[PDB]
Write a protein that binds this ligand. Structure first.
Ligand SMILES: *[C@H](F)C(=O)N(C[C@@H]1CCNC1=O)NC(=O)[C@H](CC(C)C)NC(=O)c1cc2c(F)cccc2[nH]1
Ligand SMILES: *[C@H](F)C(=O)N(C[C@@H]1CCNC1=O)NC(=O)[C@H](CC(C)C)NC(=O)c1cc2c(F)cccc2[nH]1
Ligand SMILES: [Cl-]
Ligand SMILES: [Cl-]
Ligand code: NI
Ligand code: NI
Ligand code: NI
Ligand code: NI
Ligand code: NI
Lengths: 306, 306
């Protein structure tokens, strides 16, 4: 019982975090085998980031210019190469703490844990969703660049995010570990605007199923709705349209609780139209959209990681 | 920018989790140096658990009765003793991954990270506060017994909680690492009521400072208040009394934002009297009370752990 914003255990990722310094710029890198992955931003001076020619700037950089520190040990850089917005520093030592890992590009509406780091040391861990507008609502300060987002499945770390940018609205933007941004963002010292965001309907439904699993059932009503009638309400409240693919993904939670997906949609319609009337769901006064169906099953079934 | 429920990185604690089995009962243990700490519940069979005489049950146990597994390695138990509600199993091997550590008993309002575990393997990490009623709002399933709660200062892990019980309202009770329960609770199979809970006033004020640090300051009014006049209002909304110690603990945040503690108290007094009127603070429609003043500084200044 209980339902919390639950992060993956961070130890497998902690063992990969290093400090990268080039000239006056220090940020985080990810050390996997004999490669350190970091934001290519690290090579730039102030006047470089005007409209930086990374091909031209990197040609001028020595392996010797990169200072890479794994705790109290300097790692020697023996080669460098750029992949999109990520710099790959080849080092002379393979990280003995490298976990089984993959690089994955996640979809909007999926979640991941962030290990927020400064000077290659961890500050903390929290859960994030990739928003429909390809931002995340992170917690990041100066020097957080190169902090990563990840999921774990059994023993395998799937890295999905490397932190680069804060927008003026105070939300965050970054890349996958192939250095391709999520969304229409660039790695520049500029004020950049995100598209309009939307509420992740399938996740709100997942969280209402979590509430039912945890015995918070007051919002359940006797009403049912069609998918079309529900979507006419979704649109008005800036919720994403619920597809049959989403209904299919909620199958397992519907089967666990005995509440048909379109019956839960009727309860969500009532909450959108009428509000909560002073009540809370899983301790929240708002409808939560940063838990996936899989996040709910993970937490409610006690899935562990080896 | 941003403000998240942020846990400590869990790696140092992950390296201490083991499985303890006595007969048919399996739960989690904490392996520090050559001692494994676990709930004494592990020595109960069926129809021991409703009114166990733990002293009598432990007399009948041999060292070999305790199966302790650290991953796929079995640890040899060479002694056992009971301290309050915790079992101390002396093993013939010191844990090479033992961090610098202390055992501390925390006060209501203090927060900590929980590494929820099953069969000695971590499921996830989240933040909890010790509630005024000496419960915690965790996320725990069957077999979570012996999961621990902790803080990190620099490199020192302060363990403050070991999980034992779920209460009827779906909240949680457990002990310090000396085996003394927080609150009136006992390690027995019986429904045990938590006291009516209250709001942690010093933490709400800390979170209002986090809001101001993040440029969310709509709720700041042009008034001040005395500590007396504030408490007269607090006590009508099920808030904890604010003390001068609370005021001084909030001093650094007051210094950072230029808002005197008593001026912030006047803004909180107006939020209690008038409500939030559909407005949000740091993305919440409720006043959040599970961040301490140190939690806000750690997160907003990027404090790291080595
Ligand atoms: C890089 F080292 C780093 O840590 N960050 C993290 C930002 C800092 C504050 N909170 C964060 O998440 N990245 C940067 O500082 C970005 C560097 C670029 C070149 C990748 N810059 C920005 O995020 C940025 C610049 C800028 C601006 F010029 C105007 C408005 C907003 C803005 N954001
Ligand atoms: C012990 F191994 C363990 O994992 N748990 C964790 C509980 C399980 C469900 N969620 C949790 O947090 N502890 C127990 O199962 C407790 C064992 C005792 C004997 C120490 N029992 C309870 O937590 C319990 C028993 C009980 C009851 F009989 C009525 C109402 C509530 C209640 N909780
Ligand atoms: Cl006792
Ligand atoms: Cl106001
Ligand atoms: Ni439960
Ligand atoms: Ni040199
Ligand atoms: Ni900021
Ligand atoms: Ni004995
Ligand atoms: Ni044997």
């Amino acid at each position: 019982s209980g339902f919390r914003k639950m992060a993956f255990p961070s130890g497998k990722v902690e063992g990969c975090m290093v400090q990268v310094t080039c000239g006056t710029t220090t940020l985080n890198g990810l050390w996997l085998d004999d490669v350190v992955y970091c934001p290519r931003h690290v090579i730039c001076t102030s006047e470089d980031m005007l409209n930086p020619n990374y091909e031209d700037l990197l040609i001028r950089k020595s392996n010797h210019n990169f200072l890479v520190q794994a705790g109290n040990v300097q790692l020697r850089v023996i080669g460098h190469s750029m992949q999109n917005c990520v710099l790959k520093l080849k080092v002379d030592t393979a990280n003995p703490k490298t976990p089984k890992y993959k690089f994955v590009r996640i979809q909007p509406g999926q979640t991941f844990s962030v290990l927020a780091c400064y000077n290659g040391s961890p500050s903390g861990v929290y859960q994030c969703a990739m928003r429909p507008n390809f931002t995340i609502k992170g917690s990041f300060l100066n020097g957080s660049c190169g902090s990563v987002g990840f999921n774990i499945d059994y023993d395998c770390v799937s890295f999905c995010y490397m932190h680069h940018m804060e927008l003026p609205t105070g939300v965050h933007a970054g890349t996958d570990l192939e250095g391709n941004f999520y969304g229409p963002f660039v790695d520049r010292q500029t004020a950049q605007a995100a598209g309009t965001d939307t509420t992740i309907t399938v996740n709100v439904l997942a969280w209402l199923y979590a509430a039912v699993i945890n015995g918070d059932r007051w919002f359940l009503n006797r009403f049912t709705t069609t998918l079309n009638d529900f979507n006419l309400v979704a649109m008005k409240y800036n919720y994403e349209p619920l597809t049959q693919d989403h209904v299919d993904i909620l199958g397992p939670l519907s089967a666990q609780t005995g509440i048909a997906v379109l019956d839960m949609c009727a309860s969500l319609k009532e909450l959108l139209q009428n509000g909560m009337n002073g009540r809370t769901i899983l301790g929240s006064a708002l409808l939560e959209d940063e838990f996936t169906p899989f996040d709910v099953v993970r937490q409610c079934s006690g899935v562990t990681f080896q």
